Amino acid sequence: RFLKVKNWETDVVLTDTLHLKSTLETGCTEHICMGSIMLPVRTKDQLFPLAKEFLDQYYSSIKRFGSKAHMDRLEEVNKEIESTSTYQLKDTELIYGAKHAWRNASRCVGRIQWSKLQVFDARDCTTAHGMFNYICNHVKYATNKGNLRSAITIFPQRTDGKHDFRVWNSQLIRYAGYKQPDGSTLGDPANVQFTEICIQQGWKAPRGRFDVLPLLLQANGNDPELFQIPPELVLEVPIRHPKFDWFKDLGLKWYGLPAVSNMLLEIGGLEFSACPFSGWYMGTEIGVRDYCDNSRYNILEEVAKKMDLDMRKTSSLWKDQALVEINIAVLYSFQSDKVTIVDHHSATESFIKHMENEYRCRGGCPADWVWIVPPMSGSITPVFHQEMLNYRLTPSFEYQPDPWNTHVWKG
Amino acid sequence: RFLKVKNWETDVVLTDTLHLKSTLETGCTEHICMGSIMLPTKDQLFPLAKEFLDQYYSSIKRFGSKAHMDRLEEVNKEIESTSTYQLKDTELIYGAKHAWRNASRCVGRIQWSKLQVFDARDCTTAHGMFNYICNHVKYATNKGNLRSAITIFPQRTDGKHDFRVWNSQLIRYAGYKQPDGSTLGDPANVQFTEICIQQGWKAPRGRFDVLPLLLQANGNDPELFQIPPELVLEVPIRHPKFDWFKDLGLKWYGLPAVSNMLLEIGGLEFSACPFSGWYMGTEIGVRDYCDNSRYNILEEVAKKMDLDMRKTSSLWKDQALVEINIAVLYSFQSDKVTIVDHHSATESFIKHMENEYRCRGGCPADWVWIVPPMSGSITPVFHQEMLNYRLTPSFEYQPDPWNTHVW
Ligand code: HEM
Ligand code: HEM
Ligand SMILES: Cc1cc(N)nc(COC[C@H](CN)OCc2cc(C)cc(N)n2)c1
Ligand SMILES: Cc1cc(N)nc(COC[C@H](CN)OCc2cc(C)cc(N)n2)c1
Ligand SMILES: C[C@H](O)[C@H](O)[C@H]1CNc2nc(N)[nH]c(=O)c2N1
Ligand SMILES: C[C@H](O)[C@H](O)[C@H]1CNc2nc(N)[nH]c(=O)c2N1
Ligand SMILES: [Zn+2]
């Protein structure tokens, strides 16, 4: 079956056949759409088809489908599963798998880059100290003095689910948040709970507005351990504005390297529960969400004040005005410091080109509109006008519950 | 089966049970979400009638009463006999209000029960339709202090006698292609404008020519009428700080009045049911003005502001976008024509959602449409999970008449 998507700005119509390979479920039914819902131990039994399906895709991508090498690998994995109950990926397959998980990530606007991805195989890692070392090298390599390079580090796969490797941090680099006795928050309110965990684990909190959190690292199902990333490896950008000289006095900065560390990588039915990955920021992630969400730094009031905008009525659009100047500031700052960043026009325009190419070469591009459309100026970007089909391909990045909710404490 | 929706800004979680009365289908499956796609006999009629009448009598605390059973019997008698039936005024009013209440793509629904319903089921000719429409227009406009309204023409019968308003809105500007290659006026209306021209309209060939109405009665061939200019309230667009703004020659009309949709109540189909409210500022300032295939004025505005248009990362589009929207709200306010900004409107919708969850067990909502086309995440709807499902009575889309009409 064929499915058509239309662009309402350009009248370009695309045809999707790829959704026919989608097996995982969406949350939607013929009776309810859950497209805006944020979040809508395996047997040999279920494992072998998952392996087979992955290996068939891998071997097709290399133009070796049906080869002796293909058939031998299937036989080899089969036996490994039935005798050890799991199996090991070849390096080539891990790399391919990690790239495809990104390629398949329907909520990611940055997928034009999917084939340039540095893969660090950390499956020999055994201890939290070892994880710390891997992660520092990833941070250093990715950051590359501001000329950011995409990368992922892949720690050992799940076995019985009692020996999981986990990074407790949601991102490798994030700022602490501290709830004050008076109800106000110092630093990033999104990280209060994790910050408290860190403190309980023995972290000495500086208690400032932008303190880089320590890594909390769990190897092999053991209790997690704290490590401070060397500050010299943590690239930061002070935020100033090209015309507003008082902007620097707001005291803002941000880190250069967005690195997701709480997600689960699924490849051929194998589960990599610690697989931190990083790229580079789109301006709005910081200037819209991090700075201006009410539940985050929430700087809109202070910025509009300094601009002396009329704040007595929302219909002056004072918020919208301060929002734009803040985002100009973020882009200006990163560019002035030669730290890679992309604006939301450029990123969305690239994504449309990526998406069309994907339709041609691959028969589709699963995309989540709710996520792809930027959180400011939505309809003056080309993605707003683009119909999209959202479905689930593997390999994939999945959510997983927070480790402090499930961890069995050894003491 | 009982579904939770979370607000990620406030942690407020609401439980939705209303979806269990969902009737129509979504376009989605368990394999594929189509949430971002713009458009995805006697036997059939009595179930549809019963379901409606059941909810009606339920709304007036008379469920299971003799009056309930009696009407159910009468409508049944009427369907069996006449193959269709007629709504009581009370039911028609309830039906219309609920169609709006159920419009999952409408952010303005907190207003749903203050709706003036004009019953035009006695209409027989296109002239009569014109008369009804001018009255609707005048009543809703109300010298700028706008009031919501719907006018309901006779229901579909055998399908060869449809009433239809050919315009997509009661009030829209004409669109003209030129030898130039460019488009004069509203590019979205070019085709309708040609149909008008070819039906006989003499066009003034300007940028902002209010289109004539093209009215179809009783499945007859549609006829043209011009709305009395004095009834079409328009607003010249100026900026509270930029004096040059007015030089762009921008104006818009005050009354948003959708005329191309189909109202379904109790299984009956009202193919001509123009309805109107008042604008949210972004509909004009973001979409009408700045869409690339609309008036597309960002380039020209940015120039007058003298912004750096060399590089996308100066955010010159975004800067100019904000100013254009400041000017729309300011012009409507200054001339005292009701308008709502996207902050106040989405805040209203969040309070409405809470009322609906508390009072009805849910509120069907399409996030893709509810979140404003600028500044999404600084409005509270962005952070609100919504569940989208289709309840009846409903406004539905329907094929453009010229593709259907045998002359
Ligand atoms: C190259 C630079 C990149 C840019 C500009 C980019 C951009 C984005 C943006 C703007 C989002 C939405 C994030 C949010 O609003 O929270 C996103 C989500 C995502 N990205 Fe990309 N990305 C990039 C690289 C990558 C890489 C290297 C991977 C994996 C290898 C990846 C996988 C994902 C996944 C799994 C999500 C969804 C996360 C979630 O559901 O919370 N991205 N990315
Ligand atoms: C009270 C003033 C009103 C405001 C501020 C309002 C707000 C809106 C907005 C912003 C949209 C999205 C439209 C677009 O992007 O094109 C919308 C769509 C809709 N509204 Fe409301 N509305 C109002 C009155 C009404 C009334 C009185 C009805 C019915 C009686 C209604 C039913 C709908 C329907 C059916 C749609 C979807 C149209 C479509 O899918 O093309 N609206 N409205
Ligand atoms: C690798 C990468 C690059 C880039 N530019 N952006 C990203 C995305 O940042 C991830 C973002 C950080 N919290 O995750 C999104 C998120 C946030 C929240 C509050 C909940 C949730 N489920 N998911 C990743
Ligand atoms: C009643 C009402 C009030 C208000 N403030 N805004 C509206 C929305 O305008 C309706 C508009 C009809 N042209 O619907 C949006 C739309 C336009 C077009 C060209 C196509 C489409 N699928 N949907 C209606
Ligand atoms: C409820 C709603 O789905 C939620 O706020 C989503 C909307 N779209 C988003 N889009 C992006 N890129 N990132 C987000 O965190 C969100 N949040
Ligand atoms: C492709 C996408 O579904 C389409 O552009 C939608 C997105 N959201 C919208 N939202 C509103 N309010 N009005 C629209 O016309 C659209 N267009
Ligand atoms: Zn869906």
Side-chain angles (χ1 to χ4, degrees), chain A residues 98 101-102 105 107-111 113 116-117 150-152 258 260 262-263 277-282 284-285 289 342 347 371 397 399:
Chain A
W102 184 9
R107 300 184 156 171
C108 174
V109 75
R111 285 180 279 170
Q113 291 281 336
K116 290 87 175 224
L117 175 66
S150 309
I152 180 172
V260 166
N262 59 358
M263 291 189 89
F277 55 86
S278 65
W280 52 79
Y281 265 117
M282 177 172 80
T284 56
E285 295 176 80
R289 308 301 311 289
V342 59
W371 277 65
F397 285 114
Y399 296 114

mmCIF file of all heavy atoms in Angstrom, chain A residues 98 101-102 105 107-111 113 116-117 150-152 258 260 262-263 277-282 284-285 289 342 347 371 397 399, ligand 1:
data_model
loop_
_atom_site.group_PDB
_atom_site.id
_atom_site.type_symbol
_atom_site.label_atom_id
_atom_site.label_comp_id
_atom_site.label_asym_id
_atom_site.label_seq_id
_atom_site.Cartn_x
_atom_site.Cartn_y
_atom_site.Cartn_z
ATOM 1 N N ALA A 98 23.486 1.832 15.114
ATOM 2 C CA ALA A 98 23.474 3.144 15.788
ATOM 3 C C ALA A 98 23.081 4.298 14.802
ATOM 4 O O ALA A 98 22.208 5.126 15.095
ATOM 5 C CB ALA A 98 24.816 3.391 16.451
ATOM 6 N N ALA A 101 19.298 3.925 14.013
ATOM 7 C CA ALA A 101 18.462 4.396 15.129
ATOM 8 C C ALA A 101 18.286 5.915 15.046
ATOM 9 O O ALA A 101 17.189 6.440 15.268
ATOM 10 C CB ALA A 101 19.089 4.007 16.456
ATOM 11 N N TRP A 102 19.367 6.632 14.732
ATOM 12 C CA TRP A 102 19.247 8.061 14.516
ATOM 13 C C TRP A 102 18.401 8.342 13.295
ATOM 14 O O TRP A 102 17.455 9.115 13.359
ATOM 15 C CB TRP A 102 20.632 8.689 14.398
ATOM 16 C CG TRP A 102 20.664 10.185 14.257
ATOM 17 C CD1 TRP A 102 19.614 11.095 14.394
ATOM 18 C CD2 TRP A 102 21.846 11.003 13.936
ATOM 19 N NE1 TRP A 102 20.062 12.379 14.166
ATOM 20 C CE2 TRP A 102 21.394 12.380 13.885
ATOM 21 C CE3 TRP A 102 23.182 10.727 13.718
ATOM 22 C CZ2 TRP A 102 22.260 13.429 13.612
ATOM 23 C CZ3 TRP A 102 24.048 11.789 13.424
ATOM 24 C CH2 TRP A 102 23.599 13.113 13.391
ATOM 25 N N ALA A 105 14.825 8.215 13.995
ATOM 26 C CA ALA A 105 14.280 8.966 15.123
ATOM 27 C C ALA A 105 13.300 10.055 14.633
ATOM 28 O O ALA A 105 13.681 11.160 14.223
ATOM 29 C CB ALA A 105 15.407 9.537 15.977
ATOM 30 N N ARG A 107 11.379 12.173 15.867
ATOM 31 C CA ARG A 107 11.270 13.466 16.556
ATOM 32 C C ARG A 107 12.493 14.347 16.329
ATOM 33 O O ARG A 107 12.506 15.454 16.839
ATOM 34 C CB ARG A 107 11.019 13.294 18.068
ATOM 35 C CG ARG A 107 9.734 12.535 18.391
ATOM 36 C CD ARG A 107 9.471 12.481 19.883
ATOM 37 N NE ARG A 107 8.047 12.285 20.152
ATOM 38 C CZ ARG A 107 7.553 12.027 21.361
ATOM 39 N NH1 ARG A 107 8.372 11.933 22.419
ATOM 40 N NH2 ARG A 107 6.247 11.870 21.515
ATOM 41 N N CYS A 108 13.486 13.881 15.538
ATOM 42 C CA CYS A 108 14.748 14.615 15.332
ATOM 43 C C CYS A 108 14.823 15.373 14.014
ATOM 44 O O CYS A 108 14.776 14.789 12.925
ATOM 45 C CB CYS A 108 15.984 13.702 15.492
ATOM 46 S SG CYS A 108 17.554 14.514 15.096
ATOM 47 N N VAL A 109 14.975 16.689 14.120
ATOM 48 C CA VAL A 109 14.975 17.551 12.948
ATOM 49 C C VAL A 109 16.352 17.510 12.259
ATOM 50 O O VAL A 109 16.509 17.921 11.101
ATOM 51 C CB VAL A 109 14.551 18.998 13.307
ATOM 52 C CG1 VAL A 109 15.680 19.758 14.023
ATOM 53 C CG2 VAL A 109 14.095 19.754 12.053
ATOM 54 N N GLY A 110 17.339 17.006 12.981
ATOM 55 C CA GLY A 110 18.728 17.069 12.559
ATOM 56 C C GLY A 110 19.196 15.886 11.732
ATOM 57 O O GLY A 110 20.377 15.714 11.559
ATOM 58 N N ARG A 111 18.267 15.085 11.209
ATOM 59 C CA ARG A 111 18.631 13.780 10.618
ATOM 60 C C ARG A 111 19.355 13.814 9.257
ATOM 61 O O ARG A 111 19.859 12.802 8.817
ATOM 62 C CB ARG A 111 17.419 12.846 10.565
ATOM 63 C CG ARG A 111 17.028 12.260 11.919
ATOM 64 C CD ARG A 111 15.805 11.366 11.704
ATOM 65 N NE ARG A 111 14.570 12.165 11.635
ATOM 66 C CZ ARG A 111 13.395 11.699 11.270
ATOM 67 N NH1 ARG A 111 13.265 10.431 10.877
ATOM 68 N NH2 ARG A 111 12.333 12.511 11.274
ATOM 69 N N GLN A 113 22.100 14.670 8.937
ATOM 70 C CA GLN A 113 23.471 14.324 9.339
ATOM 71 C C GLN A 113 23.690 12.837 9.689
ATOM 72 O O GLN A 113 24.824 12.413 10.005
ATOM 73 C CB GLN A 113 23.830 15.194 10.569
ATOM 74 C CG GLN A 113 23.974 16.677 10.229
ATOM 75 C CD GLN A 113 25.303 16.936 9.594
ATOM 76 O OE1 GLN A 113 26.243 16.170 9.811
ATOM 77 N NE2 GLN A 113 25.418 18.030 8.850
ATOM 78 N N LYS A 116 26.865 10.728 9.195
ATOM 79 C CA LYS A 116 28.109 11.180 9.840
ATOM 80 C C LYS A 116 27.884 11.067 11.330
ATOM 81 O O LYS A 116 27.231 11.919 11.965
ATOM 82 C CB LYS A 116 28.478 12.631 9.520
ATOM 83 C CG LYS A 116 28.916 12.882 8.098
ATOM 84 C CD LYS A 116 27.709 13.158 7.208
ATOM 85 C CE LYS A 116 28.123 13.525 5.796
ATOM 86 N NZ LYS A 116 27.281 14.677 5.387
ATOM 87 N N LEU A 117 28.407 10.005 11.888
ATOM 88 C CA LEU A 117 28.222 9.757 13.279
ATOM 89 C C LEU A 117 29.423 8.955 13.729
ATOM 90 O O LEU A 117 29.702 7.900 13.184
ATOM 91 C CB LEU A 117 26.937 8.974 13.523
ATOM 92 C CG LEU A 117 26.722 8.562 14.971
ATOM 93 C CD1 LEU A 117 26.505 9.741 15.933
ATOM 94 C CD2 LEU A 117 25.563 7.562 15.034
ATOM 95 N N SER A 150 29.199 14.937 15.744
ATOM 96 C CA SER A 150 28.258 13.942 16.305
ATOM 97 C C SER A 150 28.921 12.661 16.725
ATOM 98 O O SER A 150 29.828 12.158 16.043
ATOM 99 C CB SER A 150 27.167 13.613 15.291
ATOM 100 O OG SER A 150 26.620 14.844 14.839
ATOM 101 N N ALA A 151 28.473 12.120 17.855
ATOM 102 C CA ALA A 151 29.059 10.897 18.363
ATOM 103 C C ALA A 151 28.129 10.180 19.309
ATOM 104 O O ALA A 151 27.156 10.747 19.848
ATOM 105 C CB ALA A 151 30.423 11.167 19.007
ATOM 106 N N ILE A 152 28.369 8.888 19.431
ATOM 107 C CA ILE A 152 27.612 8.079 20.369
ATOM 108 C C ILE A 152 28.600 7.133 20.995
ATOM 109 O O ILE A 152 29.513 6.661 20.297
ATOM 110 C CB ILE A 152 26.466 7.308 19.690
ATOM 111 C CG1 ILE A 152 25.706 6.479 20.738
ATOM 112 C CG2 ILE A 152 26.992 6.418 18.574
ATOM 113 C CD1 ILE A 152 24.424 5.809 20.218
ATOM 114 N N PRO A 258 25.061 19.380 23.366
ATOM 115 C CA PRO A 258 23.866 18.695 23.776
ATOM 116 C C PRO A 258 24.126 17.195 23.620
ATOM 117 O O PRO A 258 24.467 16.732 22.519
ATOM 118 C CB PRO A 258 22.819 19.199 22.770
ATOM 119 C CG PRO A 258 23.605 19.439 21.518
ATOM 120 C CD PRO A 258 25.018 19.788 21.948
ATOM 121 N N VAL A 260 22.377 13.577 24.850
ATOM 122 C CA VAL A 260 21.311 12.815 25.519
ATOM 123 C C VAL A 260 21.887 11.516 26.111
ATOM 124 O O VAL A 260 22.525 10.747 25.400
ATOM 125 C CB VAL A 260 20.127 12.535 24.584
ATOM 126 C CG1 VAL A 260 19.209 11.478 25.188
ATOM 127 C CG2 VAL A 260 19.303 13.824 24.357
ATOM 128 N N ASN A 262 19.967 9.402 28.687
ATOM 129 C CA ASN A 262 18.963 8.583 29.397
ATOM 130 C C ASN A 262 18.134 7.663 28.496
ATOM 131 O O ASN A 262 17.125 7.122 28.942
ATOM 132 C CB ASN A 262 17.997 9.459 30.250
ATOM 133 C CG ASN A 262 17.239 10.481 29.423
ATOM 134 O OD1 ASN A 262 17.430 10.613 28.183
ATOM 135 N ND2 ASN A 262 16.383 11.251 30.101
ATOM 136 N N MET A 263 18.535 7.505 27.237
ATOM 137 C CA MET A 263 17.707 6.759 26.287
ATOM 138 C C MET A 263 18.278 5.367 26.055
ATOM 139 O O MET A 263 19.402 5.081 26.468
ATOM 140 C CB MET A 263 17.478 7.539 24.985
ATOM 141 C CG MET A 263 16.576 8.769 25.183
ATOM 142 S SD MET A 263 16.116 9.529 23.609
ATOM 143 C CE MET A 263 14.625 8.594 23.226
ATOM 144 N N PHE A 277 24.533 9.974 23.317
ATOM 145 C CA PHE A 277 24.800 10.529 21.992
ATOM 146 C C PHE A 277 24.715 12.065 21.994
ATOM 147 O O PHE A 277 23.971 12.667 22.781
ATOM 148 C CB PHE A 277 23.847 9.928 20.951
ATOM 149 C CG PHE A 277 22.369 10.077 21.293
ATOM 150 C CD1 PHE A 277 21.669 11.227 20.946
ATOM 151 C CD2 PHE A 277 21.665 9.024 21.882
ATOM 152 C CE1 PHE A 277 20.318 11.355 21.227
ATOM 153 C CE2 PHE A 277 20.315 9.148 22.176
ATOM 154 C CZ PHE A 277 19.633 10.319 21.837
ATOM 155 N N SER A 278 25.451 12.689 21.098
ATOM 156 C CA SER A 278 25.519 14.135 21.049
ATOM 157 C C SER A 278 25.614 14.625 19.609
ATOM 158 O O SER A 278 26.138 13.930 18.721
ATOM 159 C CB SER A 278 26.719 14.639 21.858
ATOM 160 O OG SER A 278 27.940 14.208 21.258
ATOM 161 N N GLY A 279 25.088 15.824 19.379
ATOM 162 C CA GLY A 279 25.267 16.512 18.118
ATOM 163 C C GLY A 279 25.665 17.959 18.389
ATOM 164 O O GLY A 279 26.634 18.224 19.100
ATOM 165 N N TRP A 280 24.881 18.892 17.844
ATOM 166 C CA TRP A 280 25.042 20.297 18.172
ATOM 167 C C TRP A 280 23.662 20.924 18.276
ATOM 168 O O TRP A 280 22.675 20.365 17.795
ATOM 169 C CB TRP A 280 25.908 21.020 17.140
ATOM 170 C CG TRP A 280 25.477 20.826 15.698
ATOM 171 C CD1 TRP A 280 24.438 21.468 15.014
ATOM 172 C CD2 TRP A 280 26.079 19.926 14.720
ATOM 173 N NE1 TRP A 280 24.359 21.027 13.710
ATOM 174 C CE2 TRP A 280 25.320 20.095 13.475
ATOM 175 C CE3 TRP A 280 27.140 19.029 14.747
ATOM 176 C CZ2 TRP A 280 25.646 19.383 12.315
ATOM 177 C CZ3 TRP A 280 27.451 18.323 13.583
ATOM 178 C CH2 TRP A 280 26.732 18.510 12.392
ATOM 179 N N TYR A 281 23.583 22.094 18.875
ATOM 180 C CA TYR A 281 22.300 22.656 19.226
ATOM 181 C C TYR A 281 21.637 23.380 18.073
ATOM 182 O O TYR A 281 22.317 24.016 17.253
ATOM 183 C CB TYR A 281 22.483 23.663 20.340
ATOM 184 C CG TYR A 281 22.279 23.173 21.741
ATOM 185 C CD1 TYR A 281 23.324 23.184 22.655
ATOM 186 C CD2 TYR A 281 21.019 22.780 22.191
ATOM 187 C CE1 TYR A 281 23.138 22.773 23.964
ATOM 188 C CE2 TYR A 281 20.824 22.382 23.508
ATOM 189 C CZ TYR A 281 21.895 22.382 24.382
ATOM 190 O OH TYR A 281 21.702 22.003 25.683
ATOM 191 N N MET A 282 20.307 23.326 18.044
ATOM 192 C CA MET A 282 19.536 24.304 17.270
ATOM 193 C C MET A 282 19.218 25.451 18.237
ATOM 194 O O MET A 282 18.847 25.220 19.391
ATOM 195 C CB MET A 282 18.270 23.649 16.655
ATOM 196 C CG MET A 282 17.326 24.603 15.876
ATOM 197 S SD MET A 282 15.997 23.730 14.984
ATOM 198 C CE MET A 282 14.795 23.382 16.270
ATOM 199 N N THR A 284 16.936 27.526 19.108
ATOM 200 C CA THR A 284 15.704 27.521 19.906
ATOM 201 C C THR A 284 15.673 26.584 21.117
ATOM 202 O O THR A 284 14.929 26.805 22.073
ATOM 203 C CB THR A 284 14.499 27.170 19.022
ATOM 204 O OG1 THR A 284 14.740 25.911 18.378
ATOM 205 C CG2 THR A 284 14.257 28.275 17.965
ATOM 206 N N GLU A 285 16.431 25.500 21.062
ATOM 207 C CA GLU A 285 16.483 24.588 22.197
ATOM 208 C C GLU A 285 16.903 25.347 23.460
ATOM 209 O O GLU A 285 16.317 25.144 24.521
ATOM 210 C CB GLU A 285 17.420 23.417 21.932
ATOM 211 C CG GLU A 285 16.954 22.489 20.809
ATOM 212 C CD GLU A 285 18.007 21.413 20.565
ATOM 213 O OE1 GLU A 285 18.012 20.468 21.352
ATOM 214 O OE2 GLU A 285 18.810 21.510 19.615
ATOM 215 N N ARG A 289 13.294 27.244 24.783
ATOM 216 C CA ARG A 289 12.890 26.269 25.794
ATOM 217 C C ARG A 289 13.671 26.441 27.107
ATOM 218 O O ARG A 289 13.086 26.743 28.158
ATOM 219 C CB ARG A 289 12.997 24.826 25.245
ATOM 220 C CG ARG A 289 12.270 24.622 23.901
ATOM 221 C CD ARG A 289 10.751 24.936 23.937
ATOM 222 N NE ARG A 289 10.081 24.285 25.077
ATOM 223 C CZ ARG A 289 9.859 22.968 25.183
ATOM 224 N NH1 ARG A 289 10.178 22.138 24.178
ATOM 225 N NH2 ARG A 289 9.276 22.478 26.283
ATOM 226 N N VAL A 342 22.910 25.827 14.888
ATOM 227 C CA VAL A 342 22.134 26.028 13.659
ATOM 228 C C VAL A 342 20.851 26.781 14.007
ATOM 229 O O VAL A 342 20.226 26.496 15.033
ATOM 230 C CB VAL A 342 21.887 24.681 12.906
ATOM 231 C CG1 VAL A 342 21.122 23.663 13.772
ATOM 232 C CG2 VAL A 342 21.202 24.886 11.557
ATOM 233 N N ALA A 347 17.960 24.783 9.835
ATOM 234 C CA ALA A 347 17.663 23.404 10.255
ATOM 235 C C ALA A 347 16.417 22.793 9.641
ATOM 236 O O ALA A 347 16.442 21.623 9.252
ATOM 237 C CB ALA A 347 17.582 23.286 11.776
ATOM 238 N N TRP A 371 6.992 17.569 17.169
ATOM 239 C CA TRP A 371 8.358 17.765 17.611
ATOM 240 C C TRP A 371 9.245 18.454 16.613
ATOM 241 O O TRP A 371 10.124 19.246 16.992
ATOM 242 C CB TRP A 371 8.941 16.405 18.018
ATOM 243 C CG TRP A 371 8.570 16.016 19.439
ATOM 244 C CD1 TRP A 371 7.303 15.744 19.960
ATOM 245 C CD2 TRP A 371 9.489 15.909 20.583
ATOM 246 N NE1 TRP A 371 7.385 15.454 21.304
ATOM 247 C CE2 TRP A 371 8.674 15.534 21.734
ATOM 248 C CE3 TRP A 371 10.869 16.043 20.745
ATOM 249 C CZ2 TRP A 371 9.234 15.345 23.001
ATOM 250 C CZ3 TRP A 371 11.428 15.827 22.018
ATOM 251 C CH2 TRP A 371 10.628 15.494 23.114
ATOM 252 N N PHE A 397 15.895 4.517 19.094
ATOM 253 C CA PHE A 397 16.092 5.102 20.392
ATOM 254 C C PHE A 397 14.768 5.130 21.150
ATOM 255 O O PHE A 397 13.775 5.670 20.656
ATOM 256 C CB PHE A 397 16.648 6.537 20.237
ATOM 257 C CG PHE A 397 18.099 6.565 19.853
ATOM 258 C CD1 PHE A 397 18.511 7.054 18.603
ATOM 259 C CD2 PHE A 397 19.052 6.006 20.700
ATOM 260 C CE1 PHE A 397 19.854 7.052 18.242
ATOM 261 C CE2 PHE A 397 20.411 6.001 20.335
ATOM 262 C CZ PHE A 397 20.805 6.541 19.121
ATOM 263 N N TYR A 399 12.575 5.642 25.019
ATOM 264 C CA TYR A 399 12.549 6.065 26.400
ATOM 265 C C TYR A 399 12.657 4.894 27.339
ATOM 266 O O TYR A 399 12.304 3.765 27.017
ATOM 267 C CB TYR A 399 11.263 6.816 26.700
ATOM 268 C CG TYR A 399 11.168 8.071 25.907
ATOM 269 C CD1 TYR A 399 10.175 8.215 24.937
ATOM 270 C CD2 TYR A 399 12.101 9.108 26.085
ATOM 271 C CE1 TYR A 399 10.076 9.376 24.195
ATOM 272 C CE2 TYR A 399 12.014 10.272 25.340
ATOM 273 C CZ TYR A 399 10.994 10.397 24.408
ATOM 274 O OH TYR A 399 10.869 11.533 23.664
HETATM 275 C C1 HEM C 1 23.628 17.054 14.554
HETATM 276 C C2 HEM C 1 23.047 17.947 15.344
HETATM 277 C C3 HEM C 1 21.649 17.758 15.770
HETATM 278 C C4 HEM C 1 20.587 18.760 15.841
HETATM 279 C C5 HEM C 1 20.549 20.232 15.502
HETATM 280 C C6 HEM C 1 19.489 17.885 16.322
HETATM 281 C C7 HEM C 1 18.260 18.522 16.598
HETATM 282 C C8 HEM C 1 17.295 17.925 17.487
HETATM 283 C C9 HEM C 1 16.215 18.731 18.072
HETATM 284 C C10 HEM C 1 15.976 20.212 17.905
HETATM 285 C C11 HEM C 1 15.406 17.753 18.798
HETATM 286 C C12 HEM C 1 14.170 18.017 19.605
HETATM 287 C C13 HEM C 1 14.832 18.165 20.974
HETATM 288 C C14 HEM C 1 13.941 18.797 21.981
HETATM 289 O O1 HEM C 1 13.204 19.737 21.633
HETATM 290 O O2 HEM C 1 14.017 18.339 23.130
HETATM 291 C C15 HEM C 1 16.067 16.445 18.616
HETATM 292 C C16 HEM C 1 15.544 15.229 19.198
HETATM 293 C C17 HEM C 1 16.149 13.931 19.055
HETATM 294 N N1 HEM C 1 17.282 13.739 18.398
HETATM 295 FE FE1 HEM C 1 18.415 15.041 17.225
HETATM 296 N N2 HEM C 1 19.710 16.592 16.618
HETATM 297 C C18 HEM C 1 21.008 16.498 16.229
HETATM 298 C C19 HEM C 1 21.820 15.300 16.364
HETATM 299 C C20 HEM C 1 21.319 14.032 16.859
HETATM 300 C C21 HEM C 1 22.168 12.829 17.003
HETATM 301 C C22 HEM C 1 23.656 12.715 16.721
HETATM 302 C C23 HEM C 1 21.217 11.807 17.464
HETATM 303 C C24 HEM C 1 21.537 10.388 17.755
HETATM 304 C C25 HEM C 1 22.646 9.847 17.223
HETATM 305 C C26 HEM C 1 19.880 12.436 17.586
HETATM 306 C C27 HEM C 1 18.642 11.769 17.981
HETATM 307 C C28 HEM C 1 17.463 12.421 18.539
HETATM 308 C C29 HEM C 1 16.463 11.676 19.342
HETATM 309 C C30 HEM C 1 16.413 10.221 19.743
HETATM 310 C C31 HEM C 1 15.541 12.755 19.698
HETATM 311 C C32 HEM C 1 14.271 12.731 20.523
HETATM 312 C C33 HEM C 1 14.644 12.881 21.978
HETATM 313 C C34 HEM C 1 13.382 12.749 22.799
HETATM 314 O O3 HEM C 1 12.393 12.112 22.360
HETATM 315 O O4 HEM C 1 13.407 13.287 23.918
HETATM 316 N N3 HEM C 1 19.973 13.844 17.316
HETATM 317 N N4 HEM C 1 17.302 16.534 17.890
#
